Design a protein around this nucleic acid. Structure first.
Ligand SMILES: [Mg+2]
Ligand SMILES: [Mg+2]
Ligand SMILES: [Mg+2]
Length: 34
RNA sequence: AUUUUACCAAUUAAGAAGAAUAUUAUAAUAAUGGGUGUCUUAUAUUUUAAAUAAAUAUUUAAAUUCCGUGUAGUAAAUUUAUUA
């Protein structure tokens, strides 16, 4: 698969990536706030 | 004695519940997939993985670089919160 630049989003097309966390405690933007 | 030639002109008041828990945004308190005329059991009713996503970010510098596609907490549970 390699999911090369595929816009897989639930609200966009109803499909989510196979390898990802179903829950995230802090969004990536919150982690960047060093 | 019967006896009126041919052609030439115009859309205007609308009578009636035959108009509404009506359309579209707006509610930051709920949420296990809604299916009524339904209704026995489930060896037959199981979807999960550290990445940009139904979670969406207050600047104009420098700087990698052969059109620089770029800005960092404002508060540490603090009052921008996905509401019916
Ligand atoms: Mg005339
Ligand atoms: Mg009428
Ligand atoms: Mg709630």
């Amino acid at each position: 698969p390699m999911m090369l630049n595929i816009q897989n989003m639930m609200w966009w097309n109803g499909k989510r990536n196979l390898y990802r966390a179903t829950y995230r405690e802090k969004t990536w933007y919150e982690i960047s706030r060093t």
